[PDB]
Design a protein around this ligand. Structure first.
Ligand code: IFY
Ligand code: MG
Ligand code: ZN
Length: 313
């Protein structure tokens, strides 16, 4: 009960900032996450024994892929932690419980391959889940782990509160499908500008949560430039491996996944920042003003990629 997690001074201070990097010490990441649950949610939110056993089952069910790994899950949970802590009163007890867990579980059992590659390979998961293939699997894996003996961290919730939290986590995880992000932000942009956005409307809350999930999922772009640049190597390591597997299926991959076209990465990043990242944090900043530091960091990194192209680095 009176057992709090306490980080070293530098981590205790920097964990509260949006651009925090969780560091290369794998064995500290569970403690970092439990710390965030306790400050964001409360010490009474979860049974410490159940939570610790849930976290270690989640970790085990992430694979040794360059990017879609345990570090990403914890990194995405931290961005959500920083959003929730800067937006104290805007979110319910069930939401702050569910969203940190959703982020931690959002890429469970990822193979480093896209929905597109699973489809063209004709992978069994593509038969089971025709759209948002991996994201339906990520939620399936989340339910499975929650049903392991001694793993149900929501056991003290009522039948109706339990159904509500799993519904938040399902929508939250499905929203990390970037194919769905474009339509969701366009609808949020329309609602904000015409002034019809209403945070008491449950269908509106779902869309805002969904945009928060995209913002946390893409948060690599909101880090200090060295972290952003080095993370980009891991991201393209997965894409190029997928490009290799496309060629093996007798399909030329898109330039993004073709390692022969490494030279075009800097321009590919500008397109992504202008098409996806900058619009995402702009709409999020409009709806939740205290998330402005993500937009600012994202813009700082867009300028850094423009310098790369101009041969200044
Ligand atoms: C998807 C994606 N998601 C990210 C999430 C977080 C951080 C960085 C990310 N970068 C990308 C890749 C962006 C991208 N690269 C190219 C391209 C690269 C070389 C040659 C040709 C094209 C095209 N597009 C769209
Ligand atoms: Mg994913
Ligand atoms: Zn992810």
């Amino acid at each position: 009960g009176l057992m709090q997690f306490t980080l070293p001074v530098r981590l205790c201070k920097e964990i509260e900032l949006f651009h925090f990097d969780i560091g290369p010490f794998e064995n500290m990441w569970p403690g970092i996450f439990v710390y965030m649950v306790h400050r964001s949610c409360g010490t009474s939110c979860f049974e410490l024994e159940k939570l610790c056993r849930f976290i270690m089952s989640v970790k085990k069910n992430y694979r040794r892929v360059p990017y879609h790994n345990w570090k990403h899950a914890v990194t995405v949970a931290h961005c959500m932690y920083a959003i929730l802590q800067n937006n104290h009163t805007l979110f319910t007890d069930l939401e702050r419980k569910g969203l940190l867990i959703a982020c931690l579980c959002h890429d469970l059992d990822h193979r480093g391959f896209s929905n597109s590659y699973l489809q063209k390979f004709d992978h069994p998961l593509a038969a089971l889940y025709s759209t948002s293939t991996m994201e339906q699997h990520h939620f399936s894996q989340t339910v499975s782990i929650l049903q392991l003996e001694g793993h149900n961290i929501f056991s003290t919730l009522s039948s109706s509160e339990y159904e509500q939290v799993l519904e938040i986590i399902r929508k939250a995880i499905i929203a990390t499908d970037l194919a769905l992000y474009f339509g969701n932000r366009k609808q949020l942009e329309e609602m904000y500008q015409t002034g019809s956005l209403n945070l008491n409307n449950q269908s509106h809350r779902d869309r805002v949560i969904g945009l928060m999930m995209t913002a946390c999922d893409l948060c690599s772009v909101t880090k200090l430039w060295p972290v952003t640049k080095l993370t980009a190597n891991d991201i393209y390591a997965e894409f190029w491996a997928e490009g290799d597997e496309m060629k093996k299926l007798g399909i030329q991959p898109i330039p993004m996944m073709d390692r022969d076209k490494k030279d075009e990465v800097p321009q590919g990043q500008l397109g992504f920042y202008n098409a996806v990242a900058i619009p995402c944090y702009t709409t999020l900043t409009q709806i939740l003003p205290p998330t402005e530091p993500l937009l600012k960091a994202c813009r700082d990194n867009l300028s850094q990629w423009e310098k790369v192209i101009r041969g200044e680095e």
